[PDB]
Amino acid sequence: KTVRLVGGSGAHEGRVEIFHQGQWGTICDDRWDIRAGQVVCRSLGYQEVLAVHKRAHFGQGTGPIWLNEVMCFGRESSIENCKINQWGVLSCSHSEDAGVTCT
Ligand SMILES: [Ca+2]
């Protein structure tokens, strides 16, 4: 599994982290929307997204920020199948790390 949620009350919620080129890294909140939240939640086996969260709601991550320019229509099987302009982000900081709450 290349996606995990960290820092939440339970495993159904947290900061979104994605594993890419040997490293777990985070997602910037700039373009973070409920369609991407649905993709993340369902790829983790949950029926629905309940909320997306910005501004390191579940604490800041460390390490790379892997995604910022990612656009999901909502029915992709994983965030890696959303439209990703590039991997690796220098225009954000971990204070912007994105989060989700699922089912
Ligand atoms: Ca931001």
UniProtKB/Swiss-Prot annotation:
Report the function annotation for this chain.
Membrane glycoproteins implicated in the pathologic deposition of cholesterol in arterial walls during atherogenesis. Two types of receptor subunits exist. These receptors mediate the endocytosis of a diverse group of macromolecules, including modified low density lipoproteins (LDL).
Using the record's annotation, list all stretches that form the SRCR domain: 3-103
Q: How does it assemble?
A: Homotrimer. Interacts with MYO18A.
What name goes with this protein? Macrophage scavenger receptor types I and II
Q: Where in the cell is it found?
A: Membrane
Q: Which organism is it from?
A: Mus musculus (Mouse)
Listed as disulfide-bonded, the cysteine pairs are 28-92, 41-102, 72-82
Q: Could you tell me the superkingdom of the organism this chain comes from?
A: Eukaryota
